[PDB]
Amino acid sequence: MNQQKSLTLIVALTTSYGIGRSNSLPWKLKKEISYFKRVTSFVPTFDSFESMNVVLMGRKTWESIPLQFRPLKGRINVVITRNESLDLGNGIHSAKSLDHALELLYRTYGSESSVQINRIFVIGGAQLYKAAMDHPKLDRIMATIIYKDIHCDVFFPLKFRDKEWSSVWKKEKHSDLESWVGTKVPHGKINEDGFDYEFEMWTRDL
Numbered sequence: 101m102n103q104q105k106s107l108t109l110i111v112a113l114t115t116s117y118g119i120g121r122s123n124s125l126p127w128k129l130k131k132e133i134s135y136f137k138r139v140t141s142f143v144p145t146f147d148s149f150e151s152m153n154v155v156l157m158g159r160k161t162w163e164s165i166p167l168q169f170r171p172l173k174g175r176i177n178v179v180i181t182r183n184e185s186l187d188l189g190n191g192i193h194s195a196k197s198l199d200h201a202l203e204l205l206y207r208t209y210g211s212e213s214s215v216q217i218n219r220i221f222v223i224g225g226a227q228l229y230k231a232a233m234d235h236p237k238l239d240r241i242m243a244t245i246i247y248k249d250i251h252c253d254v255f256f257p258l259k260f261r262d263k264e265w266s267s268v269w270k271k272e273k274h275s276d277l278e279s280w281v282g283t284k285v286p287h288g289k290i291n292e293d294g295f296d297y298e299f300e301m302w303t304r305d306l
Protein backbone atom coordinates (compact mmCIF):
# COMPACT_ATOMS: atom_id res chain seq x y z
CA MET A 101 0.00 0.00 0.00
CA ASN A 102 2.68 2.48 -1.04
CA GLN A 103 3.07 1.90 -4.78
CA GLN A 104 -0.40 1.31 -6.25
CA LYS A 105 0.12 4.37 -8.44
CA SER A 106 2.60 5.35 -11.17
CA LEU A 107 4.52 8.62 -11.13
CA THR A 108 4.59 11.23 -13.88
CA LEU A 109 7.43 13.72 -14.26
CA ILE A 110 6.90 17.16 -15.84
CA VAL A 111 9.71 19.42 -17.03
CA ALA A 112 10.86 21.98 -19.61
CA LEU A 113 14.36 21.33 -21.05
CA THR A 114 16.73 22.44 -23.84
CA THR A 115 18.14 20.15 -26.52
CA SER A 116 21.26 19.76 -24.32
CA TYR A 117 19.08 18.77 -21.34
CA GLY A 118 19.52 22.15 -19.68
CA ILE A 119 16.81 22.73 -17.08
CA GLY A 120 17.99 25.63 -14.95
CA ARG A 121 20.38 28.51 -14.28
CA SER A 122 21.14 30.31 -11.01
CA ASN A 123 18.47 28.54 -8.94
CA SER A 124 15.96 29.70 -11.56
CA LEU A 125 14.91 29.42 -15.21
CA PRO A 126 17.08 31.01 -17.93
CA TRP A 127 13.88 31.63 -19.92
CA LYS A 128 10.41 33.04 -19.34
CA LEU A 129 7.41 31.54 -21.13
CA LYS A 130 4.09 32.52 -19.60
CA LYS A 131 2.25 30.13 -21.96
CA GLU A 132 4.59 27.28 -21.03
CA ILE A 133 3.73 27.79 -17.34
CA SER A 134 0.04 27.92 -18.30
CA TYR A 135 0.48 24.45 -19.75
CA PHE A 136 2.22 23.28 -16.58
CA LYS A 137 -0.73 24.47 -14.50
CA ARG A 138 -3.36 22.86 -16.74
CA VAL A 139 -1.57 19.53 -16.82
CA THR A 140 -0.89 19.24 -13.10
CA SER A 141 -4.33 20.57 -12.15
CA PHE A 142 -6.61 18.69 -14.52
CA VAL A 143 -8.83 15.97 -13.12
CA PRO A 144 -11.76 14.35 -14.99
CA THR A 145 -14.94 16.31 -14.25
CA PHE A 146 -16.71 13.32 -12.71
CA ASP A 147 -13.78 12.63 -10.37
CA SER A 148 -12.99 16.31 -9.85
CA PHE A 149 -15.71 16.39 -7.20
CA GLU A 150 -13.50 14.92 -4.46
CA SER A 151 -10.20 14.14 -6.22
CA MET A 152 -7.04 16.24 -6.66
CA ASN A 153 -3.62 15.67 -8.21
CA VAL A 154 -0.38 15.94 -6.26
CA VAL A 155 2.75 17.88 -7.12
CA LEU A 156 5.97 16.70 -5.53
CA MET A 157 8.90 19.14 -5.55
CA GLY A 158 12.31 19.71 -3.99
CA ARG A 159 12.81 22.37 -1.33
CA LYS A 160 14.88 24.51 -3.68
CA THR A 161 12.15 24.58 -6.32
CA TRP A 162 9.57 25.34 -3.63
CA GLU A 163 11.57 28.44 -2.69
CA SER A 164 12.26 29.41 -6.29
CA ILE A 165 8.53 29.80 -6.87
CA PRO A 166 6.83 33.19 -6.23
CA LEU A 167 4.77 33.36 -3.03
CA GLN A 168 1.81 34.72 -4.97
CA PHE A 169 1.66 31.39 -6.80
CA ARG A 170 2.52 29.26 -3.75
CA PRO A 171 1.26 26.89 -2.76
CA LEU A 172 0.11 25.48 -6.11
CA LYS A 173 -3.62 25.96 -5.92
CA GLY A 174 -6.07 23.22 -6.73
CA ARG A 175 -3.37 20.63 -6.04
CA ILE A 176 -1.92 18.80 -3.02
CA ASN A 177 1.60 20.13 -2.40
CA VAL A 178 4.43 18.09 -0.88
CA VAL A 179 7.96 19.39 -0.46
CA ILE A 180 10.84 16.90 -0.34
CA THR A 181 13.52 17.87 2.19
CA ARG A 182 16.00 15.34 3.62
CA ASN A 183 16.82 17.24 6.86
CA GLU A 184 13.13 17.85 8.15
CA SER A 185 13.65 21.11 10.18
CA LEU A 186 10.81 23.27 9.03
CA ASP A 187 8.99 24.30 6.24
CA LEU A 188 6.13 26.33 5.85
CA GLY A 189 3.81 25.47 3.13
CA ASN A 190 0.68 26.18 5.00
CA GLY A 191 -0.46 22.71 6.07
CA ILE A 192 1.90 21.88 3.24
CA HIS A 193 3.06 18.30 3.48
CA SER A 194 6.74 17.68 4.17
CA ALA A 195 8.66 14.48 3.39
CA LYS A 196 12.31 13.41 3.57
CA SER A 197 12.26 11.25 0.44
CA LEU A 198 10.18 10.26 -2.54
CA ASP A 199 8.88 7.08 -0.97
CA HIS A 200 8.39 8.83 2.37
CA ALA A 201 6.22 11.32 0.49
CA LEU A 202 4.17 8.54 -1.10
CA GLU A 203 3.52 6.77 2.23
CA LEU A 204 2.51 10.03 3.88
CA LEU A 205 -0.02 10.67 1.10
CA TYR A 206 -1.49 7.15 1.22
CA ARG A 207 -1.94 7.59 4.97
CA THR A 208 -3.23 11.14 4.84
CA TYR A 209 -5.58 10.46 1.94
CA GLY A 210 -7.07 6.99 2.35
CA SER A 211 -10.58 5.59 1.99
CA GLU A 212 -12.01 7.54 4.93
CA SER A 213 -10.54 10.66 3.31
CA SER A 214 -12.99 13.16 1.82
CA VAL A 215 -10.22 14.10 -0.61
CA GLN A 216 -8.92 11.41 -2.97
CA ILE A 217 -5.70 11.45 -5.00
CA ASN A 218 -5.89 11.35 -8.80
CA ARG A 219 -2.42 11.78 -10.25
CA ILE A 220 1.00 12.24 -8.70
CA PHE A 221 3.45 14.57 -10.44
CA VAL A 222 7.18 15.29 -9.88
CA ILE A 223 7.82 18.94 -10.80
CA GLY A 224 10.77 20.31 -8.93
CA GLY A 225 14.50 20.07 -8.78
CA ALA A 226 17.25 18.35 -10.71
CA GLN A 227 18.00 16.46 -7.49
CA LEU A 228 14.39 15.29 -7.14
CA TYR A 229 14.42 14.53 -10.85
CA LYS A 230 17.37 12.20 -10.26
CA ALA A 231 15.42 10.32 -7.58
CA ALA A 232 12.30 10.09 -9.77
CA MET A 233 14.19 8.70 -12.77
CA ASP A 234 15.60 5.94 -10.55
CA HIS A 235 12.17 5.24 -9.03
CA PRO A 236 10.53 2.03 -10.30
CA LYS A 237 7.11 3.70 -10.56
CA LEU A 238 8.15 6.61 -12.83
CA ASP A 239 6.73 5.73 -16.29
CA ARG A 240 5.81 9.05 -17.91
CA ILE A 241 7.52 12.31 -18.82
CA MET A 242 5.63 15.51 -19.78
CA ALA A 243 8.49 17.30 -21.45
CA THR A 244 8.59 20.69 -23.06
CA ILE A 245 11.57 20.67 -25.47
CA ILE A 246 13.19 24.08 -26.00
CA TYR A 247 15.06 24.28 -29.33
CA LYS A 248 17.79 26.53 -28.06
CA ASP A 249 21.03 25.62 -26.31
CA ILE A 250 20.46 28.22 -23.57
CA HIS A 251 23.24 28.43 -21.01
CA CYS A 252 22.27 26.40 -17.93
CA ASP A 253 24.23 25.22 -14.87
CA VAL A 254 21.79 22.44 -13.91
CA PHE A 255 20.81 19.52 -16.14
CA PHE A 256 18.22 16.75 -16.38
CA PRO A 257 19.67 13.45 -14.99
CA LEU A 258 18.89 11.10 -17.90
CA LYS A 259 18.90 11.57 -21.69
CA PHE A 260 15.57 9.93 -22.37
CA ARG A 261 15.31 11.44 -25.87
CA ASP A 262 18.72 10.07 -27.00
CA LYS A 263 19.40 6.90 -29.01
CA GLU A 264 20.95 4.98 -26.07
CA TRP A 265 17.55 5.15 -24.31
CA SER A 266 15.36 4.69 -27.39
CA SER A 267 14.41 1.13 -26.40
CA VAL A 268 13.12 2.26 -22.97
CA TRP A 269 11.69 5.71 -23.56
CA LYS A 270 9.25 6.21 -26.40
CA LYS A 271 7.60 9.39 -27.65
CA GLU A 272 3.80 9.21 -27.80
CA LYS A 273 1.59 10.65 -30.55
CA HIS A 274 0.08 14.06 -29.90
CA SER A 275 -3.41 12.59 -29.95
CA ASP A 276 -2.42 10.21 -27.12
CA LEU A 277 -0.92 13.16 -25.23
CA GLU A 278 -4.14 15.22 -25.41
CA SER A 279 -6.01 12.08 -24.41
CA TRP A 280 -3.92 11.44 -21.29
CA VAL A 281 -3.92 15.10 -20.32
CA GLY A 282 -7.66 15.36 -20.73
CA THR A 283 -8.05 18.36 -23.01
CA LYS A 284 -6.71 19.75 -26.27
CA VAL A 285 -3.02 20.75 -26.26
CA PRO A 286 -1.08 23.04 -28.66
CA HIS A 287 0.55 20.85 -31.31
CA GLY A 288 3.71 21.74 -33.17
CA LYS A 289 6.32 24.41 -32.52
CA ILE A 290 5.56 27.46 -30.40
CA ASN A 291 7.52 30.70 -30.50
CA GLU A 292 7.61 32.62 -27.22
CA ASP A 293 10.38 35.19 -26.75
CA GLY A 294 12.62 34.27 -29.67
CA PHE A 295 12.46 30.68 -28.47
CA ASP A 296 10.93 27.74 -30.34
CA TYR A 297 9.51 24.88 -28.22
CA GLU A 298 6.87 22.14 -28.29
CA PHE A 299 5.07 19.74 -25.97
CA GLU A 300 5.89 16.04 -25.96
CA MET A 301 4.90 13.09 -23.81
CA TRP A 302 7.27 10.15 -23.31
CA THR A 303 6.61 6.83 -21.60
CA ARG A 304 8.31 3.57 -20.61
CA ASP A 305 7.01 0.23 -19.45
CA LEU A 306 7.29 -0.33 -15.68
Ligand SMILES: NC(=O)C1=CN([C@@H]2O[C@H](COP(=O)(O)OP(=O)(O)OC[C@H]3O[C@@H](n4cnc5c(N)ncnc54)[C@H](OP(=O)(O)O)[C@@H]3O)[C@@H](O)[C@H]2O)C=CC1
Pocket residue numbers: 110111112113118119120121122123124125157158159160161162164180181182183196197198223224225226227228229231254
Ligand atom coordinates in the same frame (compact mmCIF):
# COMPACT_ATOMS: atom_id res chain seq x y z
N1 LIG B 1 13.23 23.45 -16.40
C1 LIG B 1 12.28 23.00 -15.56
O1 LIG B 1 11.17 22.54 -15.81
C2 LIG B 1 12.50 23.01 -14.15
C3 LIG B 1 13.73 23.50 -13.72
N2 LIG B 1 13.99 23.52 -12.28
C4 LIG B 1 15.35 24.06 -11.87
O2 LIG B 1 16.17 23.04 -11.21
C5 LIG B 1 17.24 23.89 -10.46
C6 LIG B 1 17.28 23.49 -9.00
O3 LIG B 1 17.64 22.31 -8.95
P1 LIG B 1 17.83 21.52 -7.62
O4 LIG B 1 18.65 22.23 -6.81
O5 LIG B 1 18.26 20.20 -7.77
O6 LIG B 1 16.42 21.49 -6.93
P2 LIG B 1 15.67 20.66 -5.92
O7 LIG B 1 14.46 21.31 -5.88
O8 LIG B 1 15.65 19.36 -6.17
O9 LIG B 1 16.51 21.08 -4.63
C7 LIG B 1 17.22 19.99 -3.85
C8 LIG B 1 16.98 20.09 -2.39
O10 LIG B 1 15.68 19.48 -2.27
C9 LIG B 1 15.64 18.27 -1.45
N3 LIG B 1 15.67 16.97 -2.17
C10 LIG B 1 15.72 16.74 -3.54
N4 LIG B 1 15.74 15.52 -3.91
C11 LIG B 1 15.69 14.87 -2.65
C12 LIG B 1 15.68 13.53 -2.24
N5 LIG B 1 15.70 12.57 -3.21
N6 LIG B 1 15.63 13.14 -0.86
C13 LIG B 1 15.61 14.13 0.15
N7 LIG B 1 15.62 15.48 -0.25
C14 LIG B 1 15.66 15.77 -1.62
C15 LIG B 1 16.80 18.61 -0.45
O11 LIG B 1 16.42 19.44 0.64
P3 LIG B 1 17.14 19.99 1.85
O12 LIG B 1 18.35 20.62 1.33
O13 LIG B 1 16.11 20.78 2.51
O14 LIG B 1 17.33 18.62 2.52
C16 LIG B 1 17.77 19.17 -1.52
O15 LIG B 1 18.70 20.04 -1.04
C17 LIG B 1 16.82 25.40 -10.78
O16 LIG B 1 17.43 26.16 -11.88
C18 LIG B 1 15.31 25.25 -10.89
O17 LIG B 1 14.57 26.27 -11.53
C19 LIG B 1 13.07 23.06 -11.26
C20 LIG B 1 11.84 22.57 -11.61
C21 LIG B 1 11.57 22.55 -13.05
Ligand SMILES: COc1ccc(OCCCCC(=O)O)cc1Cc1cnc(N)nc1N
Pocket residue numbers: 110111112125132133136137138161164165169170172173222223224242243244
Ligand atom coordinates in the same frame (compact mmCIF):
# COMPACT_ATOMS: atom_id res chain seq x y z
C1 LIG C 1 10.91 26.08 -12.13
O1 LIG C 1 9.90 25.91 -13.14
C2 LIG C 1 8.63 26.43 -12.80
C3 LIG C 1 8.45 27.83 -12.60
C4 LIG C 1 7.19 28.38 -12.25
C5 LIG C 1 6.10 27.52 -12.12
O2 LIG C 1 4.86 28.08 -11.78
C6 LIG C 1 4.17 27.46 -10.66
C7 LIG C 1 3.05 28.42 -10.16
C8 LIG C 1 2.27 29.19 -11.28
C9 LIG C 1 1.46 28.30 -12.23
C10 LIG C 1 0.57 27.31 -11.51
O3 LIG C 1 -0.32 27.70 -10.78
O4 LIG C 1 0.75 26.11 -11.67
C11 LIG C 1 6.25 26.09 -12.32
C12 LIG C 1 7.52 25.54 -12.66
C13 LIG C 1 7.73 24.02 -12.89
C14 LIG C 1 7.55 23.53 -14.36
C15 LIG C 1 7.20 24.37 -15.46
N1 LIG C 1 7.06 23.86 -16.74
C16 LIG C 1 7.26 22.55 -17.00
N2 LIG C 1 7.11 22.04 -18.32
N3 LIG C 1 7.59 21.69 -16.00
C17 LIG C 1 7.74 22.15 -14.66
N4 LIG C 1 8.07 21.30 -13.73
